[PDB]
Amino acid sequence: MTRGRVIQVMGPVVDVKFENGHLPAIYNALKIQHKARNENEVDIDLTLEVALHLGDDTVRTIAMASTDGLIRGMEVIDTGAPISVPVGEVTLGRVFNVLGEPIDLEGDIPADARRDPIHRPAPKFEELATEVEILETGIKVVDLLAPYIKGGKIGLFGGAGVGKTVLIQELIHNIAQEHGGISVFAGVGERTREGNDLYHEMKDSGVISKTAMVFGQMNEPPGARMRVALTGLTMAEYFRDEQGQDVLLFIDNIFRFTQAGSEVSALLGRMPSAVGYQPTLATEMGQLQERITSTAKGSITSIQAIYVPADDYTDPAPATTFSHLDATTNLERKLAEMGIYPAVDPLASTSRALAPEIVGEEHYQVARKVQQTLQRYKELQDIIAILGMDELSDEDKLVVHRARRIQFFLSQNFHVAEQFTGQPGSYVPVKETVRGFKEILEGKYDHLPEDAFRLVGRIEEVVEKAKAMG
């Protein structure tokens, strides 16, 4: 029967015993609710997930919270299914922990709401899309140099104080406005105060009206710090399937997900792999990433922040992550200091979509020309800073002029920054931005001052602003 009792407690790992022939299947969830029968006890409410069968009708589980106060002999209730999380429009604008219980003070979800299992087989071979598509985000730099693929994974590098949150907000807002697609944020292993500040920022900017957030704090046990990513993904899958609309999924940190996996595996007791990581690192990463695909009637595109340990690009976790990535954008302090936003690197960033078979020969040629011009400008800057522009020939002076114009034109205004500037922002289509960049390359607008290329977006706004100062 469903009733089972505890026999062993070792830190976060707990063991249960059931009547023979009624053992729960793997990955199920066990609920423990107890009332203090006397003063030598403490009320406990804990949820465990089943991991291993040790035989003898015993089960080895791991905990999702503190295990203090546990007594050998408490009743254990089996739910019969993996962790269930509410899905639907009710999730939007709320903050959940790993178990689907709201963290904010808006109230509890009604019990009748539809819920879905966390663990789920990946979509079959048949349902996948047969061709590649380009996600038009409306941010000039990314849709020019490093395009995003519908259903692909995108890596995002950069430290603190660089505008990463601003870029996230702008991406969410643009995607919502121009595609009717919701977005989901999953803070795997975040700092609590940073998460709180991000929540406040999003609420003030008003983006939060079309998003759902899941937070796993760094003070949580490894079980929760592993399952938060999966619960976010299963939140997004409902919108992909039932609604049939393109969705955005963010992951605050995936290296911490791998680290939590390693810690839980060490607790379970398996021998460590190469650098102490769990042996099952590759398959765990696969079972996570393989559900972020693009099917015949929807798509999920993922923006994942990566922190490299000890700055080693050959470490097993960065290697395993990079085995899946489709594109990379890099955020740079120097571009931050200059009055340029979103301060994304135009050279370090790269993509797989940058091919004539996908974006088109014209787009590819314009992008390559911009790349080489910027590289040449970077080469000349070092000598020019000591020698002055005098030694520069006429052709190199023209190159420097065009490179400065291009580099300044790469910046853009944001709907987010309205609260601090008043500029209504812009959403620049791919065709318009590539045409404008080609025309600027042709030298048609070389007579304008460089500052006319600052924070406009579309090419028409450039001439309008230039006329504005006259």
Binding site: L52, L128, R270, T283, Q289, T293, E357
Partner: protein, 478 residues
């Protein structure tokens, strides 16, 4: 209580442990109540160590395990061509079931020392750089090693496409690749029309480590059927690195002691047992063949790593791809410094052999003239001519995506490059020159193309020269 049918005890991380099954043999196939197949590895005194080939979520302690009476088998047949199957041989593309009648054991002895024979026939890979510097025979086991995002998969698809008319079956085995990537690959193969003579075996990342580990053996077992019947086969493993990772995970789960870089000591045997089945049989055995082109993924271009060393020891030769030249959009560098085909050379036809030597010398010279020699204009001896000719060679060595060049046009363009006919046209027009050159040969060079196709030897040098000169006259410089 009859003990010819087992009973589960422990389940965890894809490894069960059944109790009973007295008449089971090591390596037999066992099927659970759910319908999931299983391997039997260890036959201990009481229990039996079972490895699960599939989803182990649904199998619970106390379930019943049945015997099948067959060792590890895979369905093989002519009906399998054009399909996409998992390593167990079950279709995954829909399109109905598969009608197969014969099977072959996964583990089979490789051909003996007397059975093999020296390889002497070419394998037209449709890539000019490969067919010029690193030729591949029809019995070789050539490694293709490089970093990620270096067009290695692209090379695989071109190699498979180019066999449209050489009456050769082919098999593409993908290990640990993304399902979306596999779907796009299947789609482009169907678009170019190669699905009439190919078979794809897939094992994505979500699939369990046992399947990842078993896929290549299934692929080569499928190949061996045609190989022994007497045809010619080409097999392209995708990521032996990921297969090794899966085997390492399986070993560490089975509580075996690791070695260097946590790899168990059995990894070399695991790779050798797989690769050693690729050999060219004698005429007495049937005249078959089986060539393999496994890939390996490196980090930061480091050959010193354990798996690269093992595979380079097993293989006949390696083809290195350089990451830095991939940025310039070129087909990634076929680095002639480290590339070598020890078995090859005897496979090349004499027509292309007559020129491969001067291409190798020219490329060596141009690559040896580094940026220090490129600097300044003090290099006024024959070094300027060497640099110009080397630039011509480098420009002509590039290729487009999914554009196989037949060997006849390959040798024609390469001869025209060597004999000075390209020393005048600026390096920016060489590609259009090549294109119009192919068009000119298509419209007029039927005699030359037929002679090359029939005799595998160069035509009259004078006739070839005069045709090239006529094309030069009819050409227009931009």
């Amino acid at each position: 209580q009859v003990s010819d049918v087992g009973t589960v005890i422990q389940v965890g991380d894809g490894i069960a442990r059944a109790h009973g099954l007295d008449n089971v043999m090591s390596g037999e196939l066992v099927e659970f109540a759910n319908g999931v197949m299983g391997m039997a590895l260890n036959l201990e005194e009481n229990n039996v160590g079972i490895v699960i080939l599939g989803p182990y979520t649904g199998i619970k302690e106390g379930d019943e395990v049945r015997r099948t009476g067959r060792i590890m088998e895979v369905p093989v047949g002519e009906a399998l061509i054009g399909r996409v199957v998992n390593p167990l041989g079950q279709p995954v593309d829909g399109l109905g079931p598969v009608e197969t009648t014969e099977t072959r054991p996964i583990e089979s002895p490789a051909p003996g020392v007397m059975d093999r024979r020296s390889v002497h026939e070419p394998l037209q890979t449709g890539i000019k750089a490969i067919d010029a510097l690193v030729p591949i025979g029809r019995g070789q086991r050539e490694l293709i090693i490089g970093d990620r995002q270096t067009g290695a998969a692209s090379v695989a698809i071109d190699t498979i496409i180019n066999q449209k008319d050489q009456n050769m079956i082919s098999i593409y085995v993908a290990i640990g690749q993304k399902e979306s990537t596999v779907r796009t690959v299947v789609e482009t193969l169907r678009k170019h029309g190669a699905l009439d003579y190919t078979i794809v075996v897939t094992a994505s990342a979500s699939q369990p480590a046992p399947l990842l580990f078993l896929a290549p053996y299934a692929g080569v077992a499928m190949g061996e059927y045609f190989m022994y019947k007497g045809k010619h086969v080409l097999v392209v493993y995708a990521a032996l690195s990921k297969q090794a990772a899966a085997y390492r995970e399986l070993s560490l789960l089975l509580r075996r002691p690791p070695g260097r870089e946590a790899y168990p000591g059995d990894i070399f045997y695991l790779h050798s047992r797989l690769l050693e089945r690729a050999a060219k049989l004698s005429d007495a055995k049937g005249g078959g063949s089986l060539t393999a082109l496994p890939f390996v993924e490196t980090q930061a271009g480091d050959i010193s790593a354990y798996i690269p060393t093992n595979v380079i020891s097993i293989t006949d030769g390696q083809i290195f791809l350089q990451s830095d030249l991939f940025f310039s959009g070129v087909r990634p560098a076929i680095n002639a410094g480290l590339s070598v085909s020890r078995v090859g050379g005897a496979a090349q036809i004499k027509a292309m052999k007559k020129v491969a030597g001067t291409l190798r010398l020219d490329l060596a010279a141009y690559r040896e003239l580094e940026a220090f020699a490129q600097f300044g204009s003090d290099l006024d001896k024959a070094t300027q001519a060497k640099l110009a000719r080397g630039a011509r060679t480098v420009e002509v060595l590039k290729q487009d995506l999914h554009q196989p060049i037949p060997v006849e046009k390959q040798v024609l363009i390469i001869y025209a490059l060597t004999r000075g006919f390209l020393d005048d046209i600026p390096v920016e027009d060489v590609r259009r020159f090549e294109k119009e050159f192919y068009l000119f040969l298509d419209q007029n060079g039927q005699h030359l193309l037929e002679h090359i196709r029939t005799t595998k030897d160069l035509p009259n040098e004078d006739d070839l020269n005069k045709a090239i000169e006529a094309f030069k006259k009819t050409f227009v410089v931009s």
